[PDB]
Amino acid sequence: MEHHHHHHMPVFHTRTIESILEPVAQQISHLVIMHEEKAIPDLTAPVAAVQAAVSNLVRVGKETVQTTEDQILKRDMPPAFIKVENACTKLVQAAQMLQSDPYSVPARDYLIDGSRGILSGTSDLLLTFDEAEVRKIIRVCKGILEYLTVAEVVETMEDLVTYTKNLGPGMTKMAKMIDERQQELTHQEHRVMLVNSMNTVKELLPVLISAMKIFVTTKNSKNQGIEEALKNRNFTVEKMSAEINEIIRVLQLTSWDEDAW
């Protein structure tokens, strides 16, 4: 005689998203936690606002699907509005059976299920809008993993003065983004290999930037051996690019989600 069973159906990955649905999450499981197997007031005036904000959400959510061209989002968002949509009709509908009778046990369960909707539904809503964010972050890196290759074409010293002013700011934004991400991550492993990585990239910047200038002035003189100077360059790049990918790959790990191919 072996028995084991409980509830299910609630995902979560981002630190913020959790500290937003976590409460309503434990509340639901705690309301069903009474697994031993009391009347209900009038939830008419407190379920109408949950339907209110829920509407505003779909609103600001349906507009975001009209701006950001993130296709994978423009197609992953809609189904969400559907979830919260009907998940609400139950909440509002459930509140009725309880108003017409606040002792009904199917309603208490019916009510929870509907709430479990707006939660599970809003979850995807944020989750999706989030993966899209981790995306914009990848784009930034992809563009920083594309410019470095441009170093291998900087001959004139004057250009070096237009490569840094450019590469710099890029790495700057490519740093703040990573900083925030690590905070949002819910796994120690990722947070680490993600930070220490973006770390070397910062140090390797003032380096390749030198090998670039050291070469731009060495070729200007009879100083033969640009190899030991040039090689040092591309070598640094190759190191940065190899590191930058660890970031991307890591992010994509925390990115590619079920809804995705």
Partner: peptide, 23 residues
Amino acid sequence: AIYEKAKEVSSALSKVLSKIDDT
């Protein structure tokens, strides 16, 4: 504004499930 309106309904909902019990 998403993370906002979301948190909004999150509470607005958390305020409803509160009338479902309090021990």
